[PDB]
Amino acid sequence: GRRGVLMTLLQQSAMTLPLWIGKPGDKPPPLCGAIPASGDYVARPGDKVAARVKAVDGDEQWILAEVVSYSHATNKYEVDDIDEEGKERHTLSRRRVIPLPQWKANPETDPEALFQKEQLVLALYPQTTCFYRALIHAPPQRPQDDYSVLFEDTSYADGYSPPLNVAQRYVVAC
Amino acid sequence: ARTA
């Protein structure tokens, strides 16, 4: 059903994120892993983003979305929810859009392009298409590996989830 | 979207 379709789609996108392969002297580019976008970067149609969207009832979530367009007339994006049950194309200010990484950082060659242990991030929560505040528990050891994170979770006495795995595609700065 |  929908849930299978969604989860599959999430994995496809995580798995297909290209590994940054530099040669000696190169530095990892903007949007490689944890390296942020350039100032006044504008994401391109088709690019995945974390988008801060307000429901009709006022509830704010960072959702997984795709850019449709950007208007320099208004400095607003249009973005679609990656979930087909999200039937609203959202008009969003730049500060409500965080571009997802366009390359995975290889821990074995460019570890400075990974988030450090205990850094605060927005991470996609397992089985959801939404991003939530979390601390880095462990960076990936190999190129194929996920981050381990502790989500802020007040259902726990210490305020944190157990370590949960999140792919590089889905961890961005908070 | 699917939320937590």
Residue numbers in the entry:
A (entry chain A): 114 to 287
B (entry chain D): 1 to 4
Quote the paper.
The methylation of lysine residues of histone proteins is a dynamic process that is regulated by SAM-dependent histone lysine methyltransferases, FAD- or Fe(II)/2OG-dependent histone demethylases, and reader proteins (also known as effector proteins) that specifically recognize post-translationally modified lysines in histones and affect the downstream cellular processes. The highest methylation state Kme3 is specifically recognized by a structurally diverse class of reader proteins, including plant homeodomain (PHD) zinc fingers, WD40 repeats and members of the Royal superfamily (tudor domain, chromodomain and PWWP domain), in the surface-groove binding mode. Our study reveals that the association between trimethyllysine and the aromatic cage of reader proteins is driven by energetically favourable cation–π interactions between the positively charged trimethyllysine and the electron-rich aromatic cage, and the trimethyllysine-mediated release of non-optimally structured water molecules that occupy the aromatic cages of reader proteins.
To elucidate the underlying chemical basis for the recognition of natural Kme3 by reader proteins, we have carried out detailed comparative studies for binding of 10-mer histone peptides that contain the positively charged Kme3, its neutral carba analogue Cme3, and the glycine residue that lacks the entire side chain at the fourth position of histone 3 (that is, H3K4me3, H3C4me3 and H3G4). We have chosen the simplest uncharged Cme3 analogue to directly probe the involvement of the proposed cation–π interactions in reader–histone associations, because it has virtually the same size, shape and polarizability as the positively charged Kme3, but lacks the presence of the fixed positive charge. We solved three X-ray crystal structures for complexes with JARID1A, TAF3 and SGF29 at 1.6–2.8 Å resolution. All three reader–H3C4me3 structures clearly illustrated that the uncharged side chain of C4me3 is positioned well inside the aromatic cages of JARID1A, TAF3 and SGF29, virtually in the same binding mode as the positively charged Kme3. The calculated average values of the root-mean-squared deviation for binding of ‘Cme3' and ‘Kme3'–aromatic cage pairs were: 0.124 Å for JARID1A, 0.261 Å for TAF3 and 0.108 Å for SGF29, respectively, suggesting essentially the same complexation mode engaging in aromatic pocket residues upon binding of neutral C4me3. Similar features have also been observed for binding of H3C4me3 and H3K4me3 to TAF3 with 48.3% buried SASA for H3C4me3 and 50.1% buried SASA for H3K4me3, and to SGF29 with 48.6 and 47.3% buried SASA for H3C4me3 and H3K4me3, respectively.
